[PDB]
RNA sequence: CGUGGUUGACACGCAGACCUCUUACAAGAGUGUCUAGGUGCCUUUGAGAGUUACUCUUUGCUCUCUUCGGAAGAACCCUUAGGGGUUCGUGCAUGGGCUUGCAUAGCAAGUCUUAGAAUGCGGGUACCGUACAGUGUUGAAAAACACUGUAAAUCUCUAAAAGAGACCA
């Protein structure tokens, strides 16, 4: 129960009720985790490998995570040329890259929910649970949500717009979530939906626990762009693209808030390996292994490890965990017409 | 054809695009008409006798008309205690009172056909329209769609209140309805229609055909509430308390507009009987029966119709008219049980 | 970017872009490679309903009739082509002399030249060429061939806006 717990706390730097967390790793053999994502476009490193360790740690710890293809979302974002195949390419797509990357499909404690066929098949305990949340939450409240997508005193609303907020956290109900990882942006579903709770009178409140937002390889990106391939690195890239995309990334020296390589060290390629293993000059200390992020960053302040023996072992690093997701779309005939099909597919916004 | 299009024109009081209605009545041999509805409780006069002479003339003019029991809308809008099964119940009653008081379901011509349950069969067709609808028109419309419920625009809504005006647009093209009937208040979700279906390019744009609302018995109430005894009539009455509703309804002498009683008499009695029979003294020229409403006014202007003769033959009408309605209560044990079902449930706004 | 070159490549000096390094963008060094577009044609008919809402004015937005037809042209179909039809594809401001405010002349007011499409802007269409991506053939690489899209992919993707008074301010 303790072990789950520091597990599970260890997927998302913010945990809303860490007591309610704990009571709920305590009675519920298996919590059934939430997290989602839209079947478009490119898929960002951030994406990828954090949600695979978050998925391989709650599934150690034993959690049955319902992930939430989001086809209807892409499909009234109009994602693909607002097409339902093309998307669910797009969706098969991510999701052999992710089973090829290392995310436990096998072990059955990991779930796939497509949005348009779960809705189609029961609608009926849906759509009045987002009716039943759009009408116990006021006009402001549900704009309020909307505001980190871009839309409110900065842009027009499409009532869509009171409809996604309403749908997103009407989603955790309906997949009967206990515990909430979704990302920074959407902690304002998250908390809408915690509120929510709190009106239908419930006495276990999801849980949330969003992941750190990866800030972008670029300097000043806080916000994790996949819609630009120059500030993310995607594990579609190829190596030498990957090794550019690393050494351009910004690194400022003996600084660590803010520094894109240091973050994505520590919550990409730590808890992948329980290390880090650097190779360097004999002028500049050797080799070294760094097991703890404590030690790295001690280190870094204290200048003994140099961006310039730090980033190639980065992305070597990257470059080993990208491996097995190019050698299985090189071999599997499936995995590369996927491919294939998806490089067919131009980007229409 | 003109007959059928004179037929269908008396019905409404403002028919946008009349060239429309025309050509569809050309074109189509059955074009299909629904009525807007919301089961609650007690159902009054205007929503028994003004849709019962507008459905029958619709059926006469050989075109089929599809009832749309709103009780999902009902129970997301609280109303009639929120409870879907006496919900039902009560949409059955009111079924069962429009049968009494003349509805053609020999024919297949009308259809009775409740919200929840198209809704639950197509929710694939329907809630995808919905979700279209309201990327295609923005938030600000749909706020301007706030006097349907009794509201001002500067008042604050629920997100439910949003979602509502989306569910009635798309409800026409659900139904695949080709004139539309309705209150004059619902013109504004109407014409909201109406825009989507020339965003979406469909040829035969619905058509719309306004009922006009009936006011308070009582001077200074325009409006219409089932939920306020002292402003309609029930066809739940008794014949006393029907003749005491007359009495006490507000009518002036000499006066044109602004008359309860008198659109009573021009919207109830005279399209279903044709004439109107009023037992005036023998001072005033004996009995008269009144073939049209130009000449009932133009003798009540005159001064030979006075309210203390007119009041008797309104509510003789008003009585004849609703004993089918109370015959069939008596008569049959399903009605009476729905009936006295209703009176024990409580009704609430 | 221009010089010689019909231009693109090719040498020249430089502008920018691409690649290697102190990887921190910056800053600097390195040696190199690369940039494109051009041609011809056309493009402002008036009306009405809906849309801000509490309305009037100036207009936009879809909008269905209507048209010196949404034209320059594409796709498709009919076929003996000379041709016809459907879908699609439609622009925004101003003149110059006539009279006045002004000595005939900035700009405005009464008509005209629909618009000299005249002045500029932007649009889309067809051809060539360039490069990218894919298809099949000759193919050892390379390249060539014929075909299909892109080049500016990019925001009311979502339509009401302003002024004037109601009408509580
Ligand atoms: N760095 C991250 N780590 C973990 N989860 C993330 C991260 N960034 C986003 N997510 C998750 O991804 C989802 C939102 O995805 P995001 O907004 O990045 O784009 P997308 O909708 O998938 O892509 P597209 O822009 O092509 O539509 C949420 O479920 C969020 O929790």
Known sequence: ?????????????????????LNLLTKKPEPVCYDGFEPSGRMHIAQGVMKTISVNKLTSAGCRVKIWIADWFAKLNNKMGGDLKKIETVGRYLIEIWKAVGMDVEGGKVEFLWSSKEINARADEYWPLVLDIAQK?????????????????????????????????????????????????????????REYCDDIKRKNKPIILSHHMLPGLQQGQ???????????????????????????????????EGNPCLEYIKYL???????????????????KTFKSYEELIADYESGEL???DLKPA?????????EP???????????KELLKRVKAYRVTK
């Open 1 to 21: 129960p303790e072990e789950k717990f520091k597990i599970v706390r260890s997927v998302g730097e913010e945990c809303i009720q860490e007591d309610e967390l």
């Open 137 to 193: 939450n006021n006009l402001k409240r549900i704009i309020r949500c909307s505001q980190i997508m871009g839309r409110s005193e900065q842009d027009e609303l499409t009532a869509a717009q009171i409809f996604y907020p309403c749908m997103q956290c009407a989603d955790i109900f309906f997949l009967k979530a206990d515990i909430c990882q979704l990302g920074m942006d959407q902690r304002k579903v998250n908390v809408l939906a």
């Open 222 to 256: 806080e916000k994790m762009s996949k819609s630009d391939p120059s500030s993310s690195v995607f594990m579609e890239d190829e190596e030498a693209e990957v090794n550019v995309k690393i050494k351009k990334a910004y690194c400022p020296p003996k600084v660590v």
């Open 269 to 287: 390629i730590l808890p992948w390996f329980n290390e880090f293993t650097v190779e360097r000059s004999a002028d500049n200390g050797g080799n």
């Open 306 to 308: 140099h961006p310039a």
């Open 314 to 322: 980065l992305s070597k690093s990257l470059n080993k965990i990208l």
């Open 325 to 335: 997701v190019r050698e299985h779309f090189r071999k599997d005939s499936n995995a």
